[PDB]
Structure formats: structure tokens, C-alpha cells
Amino acid sequence: PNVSRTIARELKSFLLEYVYGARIRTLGEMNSESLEVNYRHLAESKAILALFLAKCPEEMLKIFDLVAMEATELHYPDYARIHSEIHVRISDFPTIYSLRELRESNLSSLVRVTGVVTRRTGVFPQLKYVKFNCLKCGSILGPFFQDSNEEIRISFCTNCKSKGPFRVNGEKTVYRNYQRVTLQEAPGTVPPGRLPRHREVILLALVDVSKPGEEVEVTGIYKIIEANSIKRREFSWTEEEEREFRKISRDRGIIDKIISSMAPSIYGHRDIKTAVACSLFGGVPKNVNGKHSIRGDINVLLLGDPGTAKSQILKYVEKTAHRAVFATGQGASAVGLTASVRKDPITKEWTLEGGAADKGVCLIDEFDKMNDQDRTSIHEAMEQQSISISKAGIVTTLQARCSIIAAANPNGGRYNSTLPLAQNVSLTEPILSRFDILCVVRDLVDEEADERLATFVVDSHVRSSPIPQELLMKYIHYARTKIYPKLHQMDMDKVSRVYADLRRESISTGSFPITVRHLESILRIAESFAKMRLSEFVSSYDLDRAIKVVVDSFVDAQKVSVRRQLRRSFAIY
């Protein structure tokens, strides 16, 4: 149509009257081909262009590249010798859709969707055109083939009129660059009972800038989604809820209220939920001059009798938290640590995908019942916050810095308290050393516990002071994405004095030692409590709760013969 000719000259006058000169000089000097245009800018200028981009973006994209190349040609001479075409990046889409709202009415239009990328393919062959060799007469014939069907069977020759066997000739054929990533819905925003959907995305002209296993925002057209723009930056906090969170965090020591708000179904005890809350709230990751990456996550390990609740609590924690997936699994396990390089049968190739939480928390149930692959993958992810892929022609180190909450059972049911935890569990010491907190429950008897536990669990079943659940789960996302509390060298050296007592007393009476990882763990627990307290820095008494958390985990993980250590730690209790 000639109506595009009055569209072209409109936006040609728009780019010289708005930041577009700085945008075109940055794409021209970086020899770049990506031009950035915000939707609000031209939408404030002309809403009819925004309506045309929302209705027919495929014919709207035939004007954009031409006027961008014309602006680059009169701004820079001979730019067509190196770069023939320059694309545009339509960002700032207001109506962000979900993957379950993708319907028949959203066809041939612009859509911004959130997701997680997996099984990414780079520069993998795509077909646009074909040819075919007819074997009977030995002739050539060719049509078209895009990116959705398998292939358009050709069975009728020109003059053979035969049903002979035909062969695929792609030795005169088109050149297609294909990078399709199977995007999935995030588990932190899926409704309960339903399953997350998945789609296939085409990436062209934007390959290997995306990270698998992370949240992503893609703006493209819907037909199979053909992505135009990618964004690796991304139930949220608002302005009306952020002032009341600081007002709630300033009054009445909210750490214990968050602990009491963690388990509404049962009474429990604070040793499981204190480790659970400090593991979900996490610490901060720090590096010195680009190296020495410390793990900011806290991996907790639960142990005890089978009757006691370990799965219900984990499930509740997962529901409460963002990007937390309860993978669990024993026999099912399959590919360990969600990271895998594998062949794919749809088009016969090699691909890499990190399964399903790079910032999230992964929940493992029945830790003692696994094979060699899923133990080694979680040992690599616990040793380092990354999983490397070094096969099928690809080498990629993906983020596996996810917190680990594992639950296990001992060999025989009973805890057998007259033996240490190393003889009790089947696991050894270096896989136990990655877990900083080892919480363990035991058995109990008198009327007191019978009067409280059964009444609280029957109160939880007869019904269909603490902090409410919605404000708590909004506070988790508000504190984990805005603050980073450091430490100041004013009086922190005193903990190096008390560690100097606490290390030495573990040799003379105990058998298992205390190392520098426990010091890193109590600094992470103290900064996690400072994160939950929403302070600027860690206080002096946060380390008191941190040393209490490490004493009732390490001393409780041993025999009854470390009983003198129950009173030896009473001076700092």
C-alpha cells in the first residue's frame, strides 16, 4: 500500500524531533544493528503508530528498518557496504502477558511475556526454502518451508506423473540462522494445582546473550513466538506497602514474629524454622577484585524420626518463597542437578539446559535415597554456585547458586544418640561440610507435650499475634532485592576471640573440629538476621544469635559425651 509512504515520512520527521540521534550514533559507532525505541515515546507522539504496531507488526516492521537505514545512511556515509539491514528493538510494552493467556486472539501481534529459558540452541539450521530431486527422471522442483511444519511432501513430478522416491536438495537453498529456546513459566507465579506451560521461541539477528535458568522478559510477535527484544533483568511491592514494611521492621523485634509466622499448622520448635528462615532470607555475595566468590546461600539439612514433619514444613516454605521449586525425588531423579547437555530428537542435535531456580531455593526430600549423578551434581553446586557443561561442542558455565533445603532419614529409623552423625547417616564429611546448619529432632514423652502438640495439630484440622502470610512473603521479596548490609571493623574482632576458644575446646573433648567455614556461616547468619532486621549494617548482638544457631547444630550433631560442651557454651549463651 501507499499508506506506508505517509507513515514513513511521519516517523522520519519524528526521530529528528524527539534522544534518537544519540541512539543512532551509539548503534552506528558500535557497528551495531540494534536500535532502541521505547513504546511510550512514539505512543505519546502518535497513538495510531502504536495501534498499527499492536495490530500488524510484521508490516509495521517493513517501515522501521528502512527509515533506520536511511537515517544511518544520511548520518554516516557508506554504511550499506558493511551492514545491509538494521533492526529495531521495541521495548517498554505496557501489557505484560502470561504464558497461560496466550490465546487465538493474540495471533499476529506484539506480546511481552515472562519466563525461564531452557534447552537453548545457537545458530542451529532452520528451513525457509527447499528443492527436491525426482529420482525417476532425475529432476529438480522447489517451494517454500517455514518454521512450524515438518516438511511439505512433494510426490507429484512435472512429467513423470510418478509417486517415486524424492530426495531433499538443500545444496541450492536458503540461508537460515536459527536459535530457538524452549521458554517455560516461572514457578514463583503459577497458581496452585495447575501446571506451568511452555513455548518455543525463535531468536534471529541476539544469540548467546541469554542465561539459561534465569528469569527473562521477551517482547516479540505471536504466530511459535518470534522474539524481537530480550531482557535478562527480569506479585510485587508497591509504594503504599513499602513504608509500612519499614514501620513494621522498626518495632517490637520482628525476628521472633517471623519465626512464629513460619509454622501455622503445628507448634514445632524454633530450631527447624530458624534455619529455614535464615536460609530463605539469605546473605550477600561478595567478591574481591573480581575473584574469590563466596556463596551467599545457606543450605540447611534436616534429620530425625520419620513420624516428625519434615515434608510439610518444606512444602510450606516453598509455597511462601519466590522461585522455590520442590523437586524432591528418589528413583525418579533422572538428570542430577537440573544441568544437562543432551541430544534432542526433534531435529537431531546437541543442546544444553539447566532444567528448572538460579536465585531461588531448591527443596530436596529423602536425601539419602539417590544415585551417583544427582549426588555429584548437587555436590558440584554446593562446592560452587555454578554447573559447567563441557560437551557436544558447547562449553557453558551456568548459574547454580540456589539455596539447598534438604531433608533426610537415618539408617534404621532411630537416631541412635550414642553414636555421631557421621556413623548415623550414610553420607561422609565433605558433603556434610557444605551444609552449614544440621538440624536434628528426636523423640518426646510427658503430659506437657501431649497437652500442647496434639491440641495444636487438631486446632489446625478443626479449622477447615504473628505476622500475616501475605505481608511476610512480600517482605521477603522487598528485603532480598533492595538491601546489602555490610560489616564494619570497629568491634567485630571479638568474634575471632570467641572462635579461638570454641575451636580449641572441640579438640580436647570432642572428636570433630570447627573450621573457617563455620566462621563464614555465622557471618552469613548474622548478616541474614540483619537483612531480616532491615538495618544498614550488622549489629553487635546478631552474632550472639548466630553463635547460638551454630552451637545448637554442631553440639547437637554429636554424641551424649560432648555433654560438658553443653555447659562450656553456657558462658556465652
Place this chain on the structure above:
Amino acid sequence: VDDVTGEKVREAFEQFLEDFSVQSTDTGEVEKVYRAQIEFMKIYDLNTIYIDYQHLSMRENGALAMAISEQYYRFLPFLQKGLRRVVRKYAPERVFQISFFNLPTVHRIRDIRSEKIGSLLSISGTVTRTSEVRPELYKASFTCDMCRAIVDNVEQSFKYTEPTFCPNPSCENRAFWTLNVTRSRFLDWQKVRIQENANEIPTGSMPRTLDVILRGDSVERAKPGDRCKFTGVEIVVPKISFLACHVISIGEINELKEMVKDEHIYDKLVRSIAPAVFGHEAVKKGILLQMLGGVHKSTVEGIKLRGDINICVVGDPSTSKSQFLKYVVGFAPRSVYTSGKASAGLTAAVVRDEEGGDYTIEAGALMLADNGICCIDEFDKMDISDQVAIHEAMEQQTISIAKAGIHATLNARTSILAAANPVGGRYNRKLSLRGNLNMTAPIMSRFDLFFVILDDCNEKIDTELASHIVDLHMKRDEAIEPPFSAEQLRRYIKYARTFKPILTKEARSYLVEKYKELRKDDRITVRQLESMIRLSEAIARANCVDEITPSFIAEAYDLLRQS
């Protein structure tokens, strides 16, 4: 011959849709609700209507339904054109889906012949596997070789078609038009696997499965591993496939009101749940209370709890404890039986599909039943992997499958009926249950009730048992006969299932003392307390009393004391 019959049946269908409005105030006279249904969907524009076949069977003395019922594929565009004309005249991007439901006859997968090709059919069964939704071409926009003219081509659900003549006489060629996707409406197309139910399989036969196609907005509703009932059209695929339009999650009052007003119902119910077994009232009590559960709903936080009853039978060799196993599966429709020794499969195994080399989760023993009893014979000869898969499926009422990078968990509700035997067979009273059962604590936990059966020489009941065995060995004896049949017992089980009762304060005050009395015998923790709490609403539903009194929970306390 149907070219002049199609316009007449289109006029009859639009007269059926035009002559029926809504006059349903004060439960008076009846008339169909279709015009208000179209007026309600006017805002949402989905056009995925539901028309009842029972409501269509009254016109022309059923003769309009019988003529449409055999020539459904030959009358379907006339029906959609009549629906299009009535929504074009009653109301001002256009796709349509007409769904029929509630057929009076339920047909199996083994009674499908070639005489019903093209007719409508009701197929019930269980879904084995599912295929991810893909766009259906439906209709495409072809462009000519020289005219560059648009042609709206309608596919016929067989294979990629192609026109023959250009409509504009600017050309008359037959060379390759080119396909176009802008002006071609696309509908999601899913292909799932339906299979024969476990209660209607012939003796020695194989449970033959079949693939059924589905379009419109009937997709993404059918959950895997759940008994389903489809209504559609038998369409051949170059194989005899099926097309469904309606999905549902499936799986007299004078007799029911007479049976809930008496007082001795429960005593005939404990001796009528297994009429072939002499003795063992406690095992019959647990089997009767293990069919119906309760109070699982939602915890005050947001997590679902284990509201089911787990039943496990143990004892010496050569008893009648497998007979219950043979009864449940012959009477309960939601019942899957496995041999146990010859068994991932239990916890829903993973199998690959070559289209995308993608995984699908087969239910197997663990997820086949919904609100039913999965019965595993020989529980102690199983491996460690399936028993930790059972434990992973039991801590939380869900099952997780981790394969090929994807992790998927789903809600499966089952009541495990575990038949076990000792390490030596003979049960010795010398030691505890743990050393004789020979299985670890966690897999020993989350079990509500254990039934230990010991035998010896006690002539007075033994002669009666042997006489009952030899009196049973005849052609359909009356000795076995129950006080009432299963005919009202099935609807009684369903009526007690949809009841949903609750506990009081006196029951909780007696329950805390009962938990102290159960813990005074000491393993016993919160799980056995949850098992007796779940058995309380099951015995409340079985006795059909809403607010529970502690006297009916006293029998459950005595049942726990008897074990």
C-alpha cells in the same frame, strides 16, 4: 440426497434454538437456556457452547435426535451455519465450537464397530498419555501464482490440501499456490491416549488403548491419569481415531432415605463389606473405613494435608487376607491391583515420545486411581527404589517426576492397601513389629492401621470355617449372601462421600486424652493421631452423622486399642 435435507435440518435446529427462551422463574415450567447462554458469552466471545442431548431429545418425538445422531458429520456445517445465523441475527475473528454432552448410553472401547463411523459416541476410560498442544491449520489463505489473489481454503482434517482452480478467470492454472498464515484461523490441536478401564476388562484380554484428538477450548482441561468421559465424532486418520468436544472428570432416594433412618446399618456394613470371609471384623472395619476419607481440605496456611487412610495387612501364610484384595478390585471402580513383587512404575514412570523426544508420565499403580484404593500384594518383596518412590508419594499428597531437565509434580490421591508377610512367614509374639516386618521406619510410618492375623487350633470356630469353605464350594450358595446387596451400597458410598462432616470440642477433649493413652503404651507420633482423626470422619460419614459425638470415636479408640 442430503443437500436438500441439510437446509431442512438447519431450519429444524435453528427452530429448536429460536423457539426456546427462558421462563425458569419460581421453578415452574421448563424451557431451554440457550439464548441467555449466548447473551452471557457476548461479552467474552469464546463461542464454545454446550448443548445437552437429553434436552434435544424431546423434539420430533426424538426423531430429530436420531436423524442427527447417525449423520452428524454430514450435518455439522449446516448446524454451525444455523448457529451462525441465529447469533448473526440476535447479536452483531470468528470461530465456533458446538459441543454435545450427557448421552444416555455409555459405550466401552471394545464395542466400537464400523457401523458407527461418523456418528456420535460416548467413550469412557482412563487417560494414559498426553500430547502438548499444537496449532491446527483448520483454514489457510492461499495465494495464486500470477493473480496474487487471496483464497480462503478450508481443510478437511486429513492432510495438507491444495486448491484446483483459481476463482478469478485471469488464470486457469493448476500449479502450486503458496500458503499464507495471516488470514488462516488456527485452533489448538491435542492428541491424547485413552485406555480401557480396569473394572471392565475381559478375562485374559489386554486393555486395548486408542488415540483421541481434541480441538477448540476442550483442550488443557483433561488432567493426566484421571478417569475421563468424552463425547465426540469417530473420524478416520490415514487408523480409526476420535474427536472429542466435551470433557469431564468422572470418578434410589427412597432406598437411601430408608437406609439412613435406622440404627443397625453399620453392623451389617462391617459384615457386608466382605461376605466371603469368615471372621476378621477389625480388618473389615478398616477396609470399610478405608474407602472413604475426610477433612483433608485446606490447612489454615495454604498446604494440603494427608486426609487419606492407609491400611496394611500382615500375618501368617495361607489366610483369607488376599480374598479382600480380590474383592476390592472386583467391586470398587476406582481400584488398581498390583502383584508387588513384579513391580518408578509404582510412582508413575516416564516414557519418551519421538515428536519432540519429550517425556510423558504414566501413572502406573500409584496414580491410576482417583479418590480410590491402590492395592499392593506382597509389599516386602519389592525393591528399595519403588518403596522410596511410595514414601516420596506419601509424605505429601503428590508425586514428582524429574526427567530430561523438566520437573513436574501432581496431586494423586490414593489409599494404599498393603499386603505384607514376615521374613519367616510365621508371626512370633516374641518381638516387635519393626524387626518382624523387615522394612525401615519411614516406609513403616504414614500408615493409619495395621492388621495382624495369627492362627492356631481352635476347633469351635475352625469347624465352622471349614464347613463354610465346603459349603461355599457349590453353585452360587446362599450362605455367602449379605443382609443387603451392593446395589444400594455403591450409591450409599457416593452419598457418604459427598457429605463433608466436622469435629466438635468434646471430641477434641476426648482426643487429647486418647492420644495420651495411645502414647502411654510406648512408634507413636502425630501421624497416628492424624490417622485416627481421618478415620473419625470416615466413620461419621459411614454412620451418616454430621456433627460427631465422642461415642462414635470411642469405637475408633477401641479399634486402635485392638490393633
